[PDB]
Amino acid sequence: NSVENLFDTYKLNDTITLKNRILMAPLTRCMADANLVPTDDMVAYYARRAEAGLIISEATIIRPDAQGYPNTPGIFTQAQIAGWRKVTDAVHANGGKIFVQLWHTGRVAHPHFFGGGDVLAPSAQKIEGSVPRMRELTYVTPKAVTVEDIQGLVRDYAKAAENVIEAGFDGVEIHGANGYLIDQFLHHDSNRRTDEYGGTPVNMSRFALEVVDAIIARIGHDRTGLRISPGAYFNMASDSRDRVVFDYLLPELEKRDLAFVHIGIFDDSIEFDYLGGTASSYVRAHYGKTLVGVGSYSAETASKAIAEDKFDLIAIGRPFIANPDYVAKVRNSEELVAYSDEMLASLI
Numbered sequence: 001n002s003v004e005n006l007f008d009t010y011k012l013n014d015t016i017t018l019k020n021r022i023l024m025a026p027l028t029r030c031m032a033d034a035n036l037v038p039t040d041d042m043v044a045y046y047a048r049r050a051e052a053g054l055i056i057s058e059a060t061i062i063r064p065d066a067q068g069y070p071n072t073p074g075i076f077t078q079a080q081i082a083g084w085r086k087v088t089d090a091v092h093a094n095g096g097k098i099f100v101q102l103w104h105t106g107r108v109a110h111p112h113f114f115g116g117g118d119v120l121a122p123s124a125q126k127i128e129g130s131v132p133r134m135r136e137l138t139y140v141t142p143k144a145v146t147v148e149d150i151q152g153l154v155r156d157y158a159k160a161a162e163n164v165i166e167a168g169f170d171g172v173e174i175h176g177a178n179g180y181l182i183d184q185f186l187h188h189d190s191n192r193r194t195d196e197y198g199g200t201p202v203n204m205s206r207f208a209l210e211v212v213d214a215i216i217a218r219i220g221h222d223r224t225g226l227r228i229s230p231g232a233y234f235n236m237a238s239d240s241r242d243r244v245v246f247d248y249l250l251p252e253l254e255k256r257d258l259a260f261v262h263i264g265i266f267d268d269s270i271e272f273d274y275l276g277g278t279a280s281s282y283v284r285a286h287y288g289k290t291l292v293g294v295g296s297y298s299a300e301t302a303s304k305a306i307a308e309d310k311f312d313l314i315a316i317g318r319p320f321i322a323n324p325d326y327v328a329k330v331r332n333s334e335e336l337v338a339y340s341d342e343m344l345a346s347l348i
Ligand SMILES: Cc1cc2nc3c(=O)[nH]c(=O)nc-3n(C[C@H](O)[C@H](O)[C@H](O)COP(=O)(O)O)c2cc1C
Pocket: 025, 026, 027, 028, 029, 057, 058, 059, 101, 175, 177, 178, 227, 264, 265, 266, 267, 294, 295, 296, 297, 315, 316, 317, 318, 319, 344
């Protein structure tokens, strides 16, 4: 089956044209240094994947209380900016483009990482268990943020975006997906607020739009994308009312003319009854601009989906871990190395 359309050039907007439709999905590797600064190993890892139309970086924290896993990079200190500059220079020298994925974990943060402070979330809705590979770090009940806390978070997302431009990135993907802070406001399970950030679709969408709008004001809409998870699957329980939240959010997002919206899902064959089907097909039916699909696609099934007008670009995750030369191999009809979790131990 054909993969020809994956090698079409794709104009995102006047600012950015991608050399092909293949994106490297954001992939947390937990290999930044103790100061959360990218390393030379990380520089080389991203550089060798610059055949992608666009790389989305691993989730990168906007400030200290965003941290929930060990050694995830940040971009709030000057040293972190300098480390990322090495990454972006290498990607560009290798002919690529790269966006940072800006991250706050919300209720999934853990105070071990930031000196014992409050975990912040829309509501005091604790998650169960402990940080992966650190069982001693039991999750805690979040403090429900105040409006002033929210404005501080919005400011820090925007400042992080400014830092991203300083570090030489082509843009930002806002992590509004997969159960983390922005997604926590967008679902009823996690957002039990009764103020202007809870209840109705406009209120539950407010935080996401404030973050989007604050970042656009600093770096521009052409360099701003957003990942979303209308279908709850990762650290999030669904609620049928979540449907009307996203029915409102999507047309509002379209007004901002973002570089792209990106689905957050792992296996996109999964359907959500309240969305009337798959996460990607729900978004496609209710959003009319560039859409990045993802989640257990091969080059072949992604190409078919794009030919079927299901989405516009394909993000590839696990196969990009196993194949730095994913794009070259797909282009030249070469067979791919199978992904295995054991490969997570090395940054190649
Ligand atoms: C090891 C690993 C790390 C991931 N880290 C992130 C991340 O930092 N940010 C994010 O939005 N998704 C992350 N994901 C989800 C991927 O971006 C992607 O949606 C998922 O792997 C499904 O795509 P695939 O079938 O091509 O692997 C991660 C997935 C894996 C397997």
